[PDB]
Design a protein around this nucleic acid. Structure first.
Ligand SMILES: *C(=O)[C@H](Cc1ccccc1)NC(=O)CCCCCN
Ligand SMILES: [Cl-]
Ligand SMILES: [Cl-]
Ligand SMILES: [Cl-]
Ligand SMILES: [Cl-]
Ligand SMILES: [Cl-]
Ligand SMILES: [Cl-]
Ligand SMILES: [Cl-]
Ligand SMILES: [Mg+2]
Ligand SMILES: [Mg+2]
Ligand SMILES: [Mg+2]
Ligand SMILES: [Mg+2]
Ligand SMILES: [Mg+2]
Ligand SMILES: [Mg+2]
Ligand SMILES: [Mg+2]
Ligand SMILES: [Mg+2]
Ligand SMILES: [Mg+2]
Ligand SMILES: [Mg+2]
Ligand SMILES: [Mg+2]
Ligand SMILES: [Mg+2]
Ligand SMILES: [Mg+2]
Ligand SMILES: [Mg+2]
Ligand SMILES: [Mg+2]
Ligand SMILES: [Mg+2]
Ligand code: NA
Ligand code: NA
Ligand code: NA
Ligand code: NA
Ligand code: NA
Ligand code: NA
Ligand code: NA
Ligand code: NA
Ligand code: NA
Ligand code: NA
Ligand code: NA
Ligand code: NA
Ligand code: NA
Ligand code: NA
Ligand code: NA
Ligand code: NA
Lengths: 142, 150, 142, 49
RNA sequence: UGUCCCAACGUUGGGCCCGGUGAACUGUACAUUCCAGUGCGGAGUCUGGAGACACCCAGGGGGAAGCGAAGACCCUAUGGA
RNA sequence: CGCUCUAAUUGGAUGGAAGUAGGGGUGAAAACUCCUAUGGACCGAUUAGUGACGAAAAUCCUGGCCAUAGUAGCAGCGAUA
RNA sequence: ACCCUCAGAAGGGAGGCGAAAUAGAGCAUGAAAUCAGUUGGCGAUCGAGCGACAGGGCAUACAAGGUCCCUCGACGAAUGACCGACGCGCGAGCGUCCAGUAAGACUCACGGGAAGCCGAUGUUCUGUCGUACGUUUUGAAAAACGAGCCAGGGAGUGUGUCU
């Protein structure tokens, strides 16, 4: 009578102490939006980042308040870079064969959006049986 | 053209529309704004008083240069848009008629929804001095109305 | 009429600027202050020059306007406002929780703030706010 | 000759307009103009071997 | 002899309000300003103060170094006629 | 990093492709990805190629659209109807 | 189609077809600028590059994020005390000891708590910084030049030779 997600939805990965420390760091520190300069002043100017090149650009000149300029120093910790907020490493999956070789303790799987309902069902049931979590599960009424 | 922008329960609702009317779109926002919430019958009486010139239609947004009117309450600028008013009478005549053919008491129904939409312009061209011409267009208006049982 | 002042200050024979500076600081700390006997507040210096300054302020102006008070009432209040960011929310709140009075409409005798009193016995060059207002043309309503 | 088949000319300064070749009050030829030539197009002469 | 002293009253068409018709110029953004200062030395927007409840109608045009025109003067180009 | 089309290898789609709207996650970032709705037939990935391959600007070009504004004009003419 | 409405072969209402009429005639999809109505936030005593980063209010169906709050305790870089004891200084105050102790960001563990609750998103308030962008220029917020807004279009290419 209610919606229930298929699979090991509550499953958490197991991480070394250092990795969970680093993962927690990333989450606490965050980063600036890094949106393009003045994207908010002109609709024709989108948010996507572009290096400010004006010789007089306030941002390019690093004037405080004109937003941060992309630099390597803003990089996330090597050990956690790319991990799902849960700690898992994602594995893009298109069919049942893609599930092979996937460590359900360390990795979770994401079913490509193009995959249809029929194949998703099969992927979702065999992924669960392999102990693998599906980040984007189907919600059936049970 | 438009489609009803508001949902309406067929069992306690009556609908009506005007299509591509060549009349002031600005006068229509004003009229719609003013008669919403009124009774179909109240709306009709109101509009005839506007046409007659005894009742002003508040012009709250498109009021540049418009002269104040004593009868306008809580505001100052107003006019007597007879053309658009006549078109709305047609709209109400239709709505109330539909309403009756369905068993309701048309006149007593409330104007739950009424809105005007500019659907285009009948393009025109006016010859000007120096061998040039400029636009001379006519607005085309659509308007929806949803009556509802009290 | 009726002002729940957490503090009642007596300006009689006190240095206006030094009183104001302290009344400003307290109002910004959340205190409701009332300055009493403004007309008897004093300012050091050569009366001739002092008066010239205030007379200049009265004369200054234009269509935009420069409303400067002549009564010892406002003179004092304008002095305080000059020590508060009266255009900011916080500033305007503090300023509005401070009122100056001619004489003392309270029952309690105000207190004298430290370092604000002027010893008439060792000082001859100074003036009374009331004297200034009379010079400015005010109506001695006290 | 795609986009070059026209005698369009530029009015130059004077009418609050950009110096763009026009014909019958319609911009032409130049690459930034709709129906204009292609600046650096595919070329038959290119050795693709 | 209303050109002037020195302006008045009047006539007609507008102007103003109402119905209908219905453009254009112009628009980086923000914008209720004023006085001073500062700044590429001629600021609604910086700095300090002052003033400032919102919206609307009519006006005569002080400012936006107002709009309009890639200065027609002057110089420069191994330019043109 | 992203775009087009070619090739090899290899996948997805009417149990709903691309696109679009709103929303969730990742990447310093170019950008990648998911969810919901819409849509109703196409769509990728890796590797090696290919090139009329990336826009905020040019008084840029074309089209569309807002303010201007219910504003100016629909009075002026020795033919005031 | 039929019926009601209407000056009406218009339009509208009701209805019928089809998987779909939000496929109904310049009719696939249906972006932005932008318009009507409406929802959330602000709002008729208050100040202008419109924001970035902090932090509060109010608002939020699910999904695709799941964290967050307080007691206590563990760990604890740099830094680093009060009080009290003694000794100086005209004085503000300083020295020695207490003590590199108490404290000390992050992180974790036990217990307790939140589900509009944490993140996130919309708007708004407070703090700090802040006079667009691009170009010309020794120097641009510039009273130097460009653009009303949006979408789409818009600029190192080919042959030959040489290195
Ligand atoms: C001399 O002073 C010139 C005379 C002249 C120039 C060209 C044609 C006829 C007469 N006058 C000017 O240069 C005036 C310039 C006006 C500039 C206004 N922004
Ligand atoms: Cl890197
Ligand atoms: Cl309109
Ligand atoms: Cl004044
Ligand atoms: Cl202030
Ligand atoms: Cl003395
Ligand atoms: Cl840590
Ligand atoms: Cl190049
Ligand atoms: Mg934008
Ligand atoms: Mg008027
Ligand atoms: Mg002619
Ligand atoms: Mg062409
Ligand atoms: Mg100021
Ligand atoms: Mg020139
Ligand atoms: Mg000459
Ligand atoms: Mg010659
Ligand atoms: Mg391969
Ligand atoms: Mg550029
Ligand atoms: Mg006007
Ligand atoms: Mg004539
Ligand atoms: Mg006559
Ligand atoms: Mg269509
Ligand atoms: Mg110079
Ligand atoms: Mg483009
Ligand atoms: Na208005
Ligand atoms: Na009234
Ligand atoms: Na009124
Ligand atoms: Na003094
Ligand atoms: Na004055
Ligand atoms: Na031709
Ligand atoms: Na060839
Ligand atoms: Na005369
Ligand atoms: Na003017
Ligand atoms: Na132009
Ligand atoms: Na907020
Ligand atoms: Na330039
Ligand atoms: Na600039
Ligand atoms: Na300047
Ligand atoms: Na325009
Ligand atoms: Na190109």
């Amino acid at each position: 009578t209610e919606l229930q997600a298929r699979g090991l939805t509550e499953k958490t990965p197991d991480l070394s102490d250092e990795d969970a420390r680093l993962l927690t760091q990333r989450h606490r520190v965050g980063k600036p939006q890094f949106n393009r300069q003045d994207h908010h002043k002109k609709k024709r100017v989108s948010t996507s980042w572009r290096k400010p090149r004006g010789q007089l650009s306030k941002q390019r000149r690093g004037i405080k308040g004109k937003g941060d300029t992309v630099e390597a120093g803003f990089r996330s910790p090597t050990a956690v870079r790319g991990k799902h907020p849960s700690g898992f490493e994602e594995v893009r999956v298109h069919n049942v064969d893609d599930l092979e070789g996937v460590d359900g303790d360390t990795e979770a799987v994401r079913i490509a959006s193009k995959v249809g309902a029929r194949k998703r069902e099969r992927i979702e049931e065999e992924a669960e049986d392999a102990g693998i979590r599906v980040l984007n599960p189907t919600y059936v009424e049970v | 053209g438009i489609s009803y922008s508001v949902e309406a329960d067929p069992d306690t609702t009556a609908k009506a529309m005007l299509r591509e009317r060549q009349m002031s779109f600005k006068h229509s926002k004003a009229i719609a704004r003013e008669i919403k919430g009124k009774t179909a019958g109240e709306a009709v009486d109101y509009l005839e008083a506007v046409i007659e010139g005894d009742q002003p239609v508040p012009f709250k947004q498109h009021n540049s240069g418009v002269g104040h009117k004593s009868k306008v309450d809580g505001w100052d600028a107003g006019r007597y848009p007879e053309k658009a008013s006549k078109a709305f009478l047609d709209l109400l005549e239709n709505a109330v008629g539909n309403a009756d053919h369905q068993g309701f008491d048309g006149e007593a129904m409330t104007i739950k929804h009424v809105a005007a939409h500019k659907v285009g312009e009948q393009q025109g061209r006016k010859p000007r001095a120096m061998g040039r011409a400029s636009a001379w267009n006519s607005p085309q208006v659509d308007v929806e109305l949803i009556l509802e049982e009290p | 009429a009726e002002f729940d002042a957490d503090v009642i200050v007596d300006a009689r024979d006190c240095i206006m600027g030094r009183v104001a500076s302290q009344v400003a600081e307290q109002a910004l700390d959340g205190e409701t202050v009332a300055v009493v006997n403004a007309e008897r507040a004093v300012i050091t210096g050569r009366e001739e020059q002092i008066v010239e300054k205030y007379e200049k302020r009265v004369d200054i102006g234009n269509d935009n306007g420069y409303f400067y008070p002549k009564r010892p009432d406002g003179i004092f209040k304008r002095t305080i406002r000059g020590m508060l960011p009266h255009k900011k929310q916080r500033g305007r709140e503090a300023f509005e929780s401070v009122r100056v009075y001619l004489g003392n409409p309270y029952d309690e005798d105000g207190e004298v703030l430290d370092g604000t009193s002027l010893d008439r016995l060792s000082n001859i060059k100074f003036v009374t706010l009331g004297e200034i207002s009379e010079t400015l043309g005010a109506n001695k309503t006290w | 000759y795609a986009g070059l088949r026209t005698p369009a000319e530029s009015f130059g300064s004077g009418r609050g307009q950009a110096h763009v070749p026009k014909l019958d009050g319609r911009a032409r030829r130049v690459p930034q103009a709709v129906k204009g030539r292609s600046a650096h197009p595919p070329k038959t002469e290119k050795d693709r071997s």
